[PDB]
Amino acid sequence: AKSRTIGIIGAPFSKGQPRGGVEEGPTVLRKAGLLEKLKEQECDVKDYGDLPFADIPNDSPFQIVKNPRSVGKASEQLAGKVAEVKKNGRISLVLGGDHSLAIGSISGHARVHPDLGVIWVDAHTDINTPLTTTSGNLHGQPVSFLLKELKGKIPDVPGFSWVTPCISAKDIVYIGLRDVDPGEHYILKTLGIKYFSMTEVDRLGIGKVMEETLSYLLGRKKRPIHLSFDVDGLDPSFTPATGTPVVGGLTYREGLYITEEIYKTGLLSGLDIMEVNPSLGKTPEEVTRTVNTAVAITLACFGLAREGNHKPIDYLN
Amino acid sequence: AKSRTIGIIGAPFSKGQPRGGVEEGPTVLRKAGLLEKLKEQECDVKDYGDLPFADIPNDSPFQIVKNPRSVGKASEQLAGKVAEVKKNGRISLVLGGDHSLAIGSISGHARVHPDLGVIWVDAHTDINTPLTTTSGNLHGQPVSFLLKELKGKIPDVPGFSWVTPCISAKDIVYIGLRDVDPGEHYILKTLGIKYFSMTEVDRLGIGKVMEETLSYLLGRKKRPIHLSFDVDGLDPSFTPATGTPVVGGLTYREGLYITEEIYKTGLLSGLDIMEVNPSLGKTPEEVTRTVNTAVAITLACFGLAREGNHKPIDYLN
Amino acid sequence: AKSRTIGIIGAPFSKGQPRGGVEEGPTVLRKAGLLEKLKEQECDVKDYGDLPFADIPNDSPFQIVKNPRSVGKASEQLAGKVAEVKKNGRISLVLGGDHSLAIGSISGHARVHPDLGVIWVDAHTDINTPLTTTSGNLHGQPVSFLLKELKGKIPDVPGFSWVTPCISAKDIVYIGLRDVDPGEHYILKTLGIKYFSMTEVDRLGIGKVMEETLSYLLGRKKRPIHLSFDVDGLDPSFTPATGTPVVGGLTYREGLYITEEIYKTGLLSGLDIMEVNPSLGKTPEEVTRTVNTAVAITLACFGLAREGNHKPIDYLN
Amino acid sequence: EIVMTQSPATLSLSPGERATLSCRASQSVSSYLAWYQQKPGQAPRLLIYDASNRATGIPARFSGSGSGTDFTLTISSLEPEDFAVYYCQQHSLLPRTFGGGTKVEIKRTVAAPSVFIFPPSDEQLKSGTASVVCLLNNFYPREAKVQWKVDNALQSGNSQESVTEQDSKDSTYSLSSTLTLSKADYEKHKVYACEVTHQGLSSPVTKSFNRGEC
Amino acid sequence: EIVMTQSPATLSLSPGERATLSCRASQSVSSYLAWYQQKPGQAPRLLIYDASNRATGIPARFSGSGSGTDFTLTISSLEPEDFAVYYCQQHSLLPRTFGGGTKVEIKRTVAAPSVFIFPPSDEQLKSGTASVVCLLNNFYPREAKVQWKVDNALQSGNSQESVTEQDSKDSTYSLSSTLTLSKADYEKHKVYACEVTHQGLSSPVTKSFNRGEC
Amino acid sequence: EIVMTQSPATLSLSPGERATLSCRASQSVSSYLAWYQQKPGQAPRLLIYDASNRATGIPARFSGSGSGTDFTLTISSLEPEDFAVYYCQQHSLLPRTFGGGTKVEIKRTVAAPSVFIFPPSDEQLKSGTASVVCLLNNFYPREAKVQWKVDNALQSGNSQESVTEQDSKDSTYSLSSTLTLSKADYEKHKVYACEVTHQGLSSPVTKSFNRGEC
Ligand SMILES: [Mn+2]
Ligand SMILES: [Mn+2]
Ligand SMILES: [Mn+2]
């Protein structure tokens, strides 16, 4: 169909976060066999392989921001690949990896659809600047490069000269905030970005939150929706093998309801699955649950309803 | 009272499912001492023992459906026993075992109360035919024998000639659906059966779902209600020792709220507790949690409110 | 500020409950470093040390009530200390320990604020008398000494002659009831005390329950609020190292939402954290989760919102 | 952990009539176990899948019964290609216990081993060791003994035996206890006798030599 | 894992006045432990349940104190039926450590063992073994020695001893070191002396025989 | 558990030019490991923190490269205070494997040990033991042998050796195998020779005495 027409982009990338091991994100998810789990239902599955990311040894850092240039080269390569696969009319499934990849993901998606919107599901806002950071890790700084309102507030980071800020403060909705920096919360209150922390989800319920989210983004104008997802926004009871484990996250049922409502919009146009670290699994059972969680999220993004799904023909024959 | 007047039926039965071990369902639950946990409050506890289920060695299968005749003999024996104990004016507590027992449970209950309704709480619809199955396991096929709308669609299964389809498509409400076959979802959309998957529960909340359930079943006419329950509909964090573990189930609090609202109706007339497998416990702790979960569900069916319960006399004496 | 101005009172006390080990409640929480976790945000942290509780060897019991006099001496010492630190205009953070300490906590708070209210978050009502008890443990009997309606119904317990019943039946709201005695439920229905068991929370959602709670207590008159908290009201998946583990408790997200709404009132005037037993941890991981849970509850009581918090200055500099 | 006890430990049958086999369970499996065909040096092969019903290309003769404690496996029409170690194995209980082993032999007659002791080589004396090898060969059944005699001293522990499979041709067996000694203990003695006691032997046959004879 | 140290290891008291006992904790139990009456060959019985308060049919004389590190157990009015191994045991900390053992003996006087060595039987020489048994009998206290002498060779390790309980009648003891030897080492020697050193003995008493004498 | 293999096992360099060191990873660490300065008897000290970039007060000469399997550590301007055991250690994978050890020695020339055997004291004969101590002293490198000879019997196992560190002054070494015997085995022999084989020695030097000579 128009929905569940998939270009698969694997990015075995880790250089925007400290703990190496999310390079085996697409490796484990492909050996979890997301492709075959799509191929039952009417999915136009087409992988495009993994991207060859060069290793620049002289990736000289910024003041606090470390590894700018290899990350910028990675996201520029990924922006080309995402724009390429969205020329195909597919839905850009990109998965890594960490949030630094989402820069080029949203970039190449905005090259095709400049009118997009972002649902950034994450424990964090990841809205840090090079100035307002504490770690300098670019997986904590993807969003600030992509916001038009932080133009001039973004320093000239080596490797991100190609980056064009493509969305506005109204173009993005956060869901799942429970680990927010004072700089992050100050910027969030500064730009007036619509968000949904764990407080409002516990207040309204996940149905009312998803209702208000789709009313905010698609109630004005039906536009392509780029769900960019972090696994730590779900509770680490389900996803302990994530890079930034923060307790008190969303439930597995809640995330499945989110992705089912996104599929029932049908305006999903790009999916980003990051922070998948099998090396942070204390048991392989932890890895197994986390990977199955991410796969089931992706399947419910591409039509796997919990109520059941069938090919529209008679079965009583 | 009229409520919590219990006939206890244990069925150490496994032949409708593959994994042997749910024969020690009534064994463990009785050695969990559900009787004494009823005997504090005003429960007319009366066990009727376990049923002697014959072992037919020549239980020749159907095409895909395996062991038809011993299962049919089991449910016919159980239909006689359920009709017997509902002649006593009691509430038919039946517990096994697997969903194949619920055929004879609803059968003997409909022999006494033909106007009943079924709340089938389960991860599955279990609405499979002999034709539309993938396993042929009759615990995946109890409901199809009991539906009047599938008359003619049910093949002549050896051992189920006594089975009369007793309820309509409007007579049953599913709660907890998260593992539904395409054949099952097609039949569910075909007959227009009222249901509540995990999507609508995450939308409305368990209070609104139970409200709409009792409005659908008892808002028209006050009729005897046969809650038939599966433990896998609750989340396997609470019940890992079930036959069909499917993640993302209902919470323990939600199931207790369901059973408390059912007790506050007072029209509960028959309870079925199936898929209790202590052999699938990886630890005995898993078995302990699952058994305590099922017992607490049964106690909240028979009046154990979380808010507290007392004999209606003065205690300040 | 006026809020988050803290007097810290540690009470290494256990003699109102059987299982020794909650004496290392303030020891572990202070070596968990709640002080430094307050000192980021604008907290006037001032510890007042631990209280020296005398060991009376001739603590002759009542009929069922055991250790009356050392517990009464403990709560009288604590009532003096709580009244002392509420003369300082601070917010009385008291933490132990068990519910017997909450007697003197509410006592010394009512010495300063006789118009207070109590949010008793607990799995239990703990409203038992010396007559209507089953254990005689005073952590199951704190509330009955503090209720004006049980005057005369309270026997003359040795060591509690100083105790003045300070609140009414309308002055207190229970949240989290799932283990209620028949005597407790009879008294609860007798006095008409507003409460919220797990049934009504599963019905209304934690947002509606907190809304109705603040409407009941502060909708009439803005008054100082003494949140007295038990960790067992939260689910033992998060807090297994509690003295009275009862399954089916509140979620960690729900308790954080409760404490965030309490901070957004700003009328929080005294906090009690009891039943912290590191010796009941089967693993040190259990102790770690439970302690981090209690600390995060306290931080969200003192302003740590999940949505994020910042000092009200510019960060884009 | 339901113990599966196979009632024939081994079996020997010159090819012929019903050679029915048996396995008992410690509990009630109730027709939920399978039969297997571990051939020597081979992967096992499924014979019966659920106590009967003759799985997927089994030829004509391999029925079985049970339901539900003591199960049978009927080898009715023997067909001597079917000489393999057979296995009951429960499945519908964890963990999934196998049977014991049902080595099916051939029952020709009881024959005598042609016993041949062999001195160690002088090349082994160049190695500083000594291994005396006492044959048994072309006999039936495996029920034999070897009693080493080192200037007539009943020794063991220095001796490793070696059991041939039953031959397809003559259904025989061959043994070799290997009295591995040091060269020093070898030089201490000459009379290296090998008392072999077998059923086909009328006597305990003591095959001997002297150190330096052959 | 709070170590419970009982300050009397054992005790001996001819029946009389206060025979108070002691147990110390490694931490502050604070009146949360109990006292026990493990009689010999019997199930233990509760004496004091929480540091005092004289549990449920204890007769007249078994008070105790503590609160909260070093606890006491007063045996004030001895009553010699009460000769049993006693136990403090903490409870309100996991895991629940017991005490050490408080064997209460009787303090008659120090007596001498009537020492009787015994040759192994010739029936034991028919068994191919030999066990020489050296008595001690009717003495006090248990503080004794046995030094076996095999043609006057101080040996041990081949000898297992055996301690009677203190008698109700005469409060005595009886020992038997059992010099279990091979028959071969038995045949090597004759003078089988048993140097017994006890406090009731004035000397190290060496009870001997010769192999083949008695 | 990525194995970190340091390609120089040890190194010896009289102080001078580039003394670059190497460590290899079992996987791709990709510039996420560090270099360390465990001095003898000291706490380790960070040299390089992420494959380069010369951590926080490192003087002038301690660059390195890598990215991302086989990493280098350049000791370019040797500075002989820097003689320490060096360590690569991965970090961005759990668990966090260290390297092997990079003992940096000094390469003066190969010298001969001044070998001195020492009898046990008669005070040790008063202790009922005997330990014969054979020196090696003032040599290079550590590659030596000691073959004890007890009336010329090649023995070991009763001998513990002892390796000095390389001296700051003369860069030498000193060994002492300590032939610890019983007094009984000591009294059995006199000729207590110590065959020392070292590269600075032209011969296997056998330093001897007689029991009771010195
Ligand atoms: Mn994130
Ligand atoms: Mn089911
Ligand atoms: Mn409580």
Swiss-Prot record, chains A, B, C:
Pfam families: Arginase. GO terms for molecular function: arginase activity; manganese ion binding. It comes from Homo sapiens (Human). GO terms for cellular component: azurophil granule lumen; cytoplasm; cytosol; extracellular region; extracellular space; nucleus; specific granule lumen. Changing residue 25 to D: In ARGIN; 5.2% of wild-type activity. Keywords: Adaptive immunity, Arginine metabolism, Cytoplasm, Disease variant, Hydrolase, Immunity, Innate immunity, Manganese, Metal-binding, Phosphoprotein, Urea cycle. The lineage of its organism: Eukaryota, Metazoa, Chordata, Craniata, Vertebrata. Its main location: cytoplasm. It is found in: Cytoplasm; Cytoplasmic granule. The modification Phosphoserine is found at residues 60, 70, 161, 215. Key element of the urea cycle converting L-arginine to urea and L-ornithine, which is further metabolized into metabolites proline and polyamides that drive collagen synthesis and bioenergetic pathways critical for cell proliferation, respectively; the urea cycle takes place primarily in the liver and, to a lesser extent, in the kidneys. Functions in L-arginine homeostasis in nonhepatic tissues characterized by the competition between nitric oxide synthase (NOS) and arginase for the available intracellular substrate arginine. Arginine metabolism is a critical regulator of innate and adaptive immune responses. Involved in an antimicrobial effector pathway in polymorphonuclear granulocytes (PMN). Upon PMN cell death is liberated from the phagolysosome and depletes arginine in the microenvironment leading to suppressed T cell and natural killer (NK) cell proliferation and cytokine secretion. Induction: By arginine or homoarginine. Within the immune system initially reported to be selectively expressed in granulocytes (polymorphonuclear leukocytes [PMNs]). Also detected in macrophages mycobacterial granulomas. Expressed in group2 innate lymphoid cells (ILC2s) during lung disease. Changing residue 123 to V: In ARGIN; decreases erythrocyte arginase activity. Belongs to the arginase family. InterPro entries: Arginase, Ureohydrolase, Ureohydrolase_dom_sf, Ureohydrolase_Mn_BS. Its cofactor is Mn(2+). It is linked to Argininemia: A rare autosomal recessive disorder of the urea cycle. Arginine is elevated in the blood and cerebrospinal fluid, and periodic hyperammonemia occurs. Clinical manifestations include developmental delay, seizures, intellectual disability, hypotonia, ataxia and progressive spastic quadriplegia. Changing residue 72 to V: In ARGIN; 9.3% of wild-type activity. Changing residue 178 to T: In ARGIN; decreases erythrocyte arginase activity. CDD domains: Arginase-like (cd11587). This is Arginase-1.
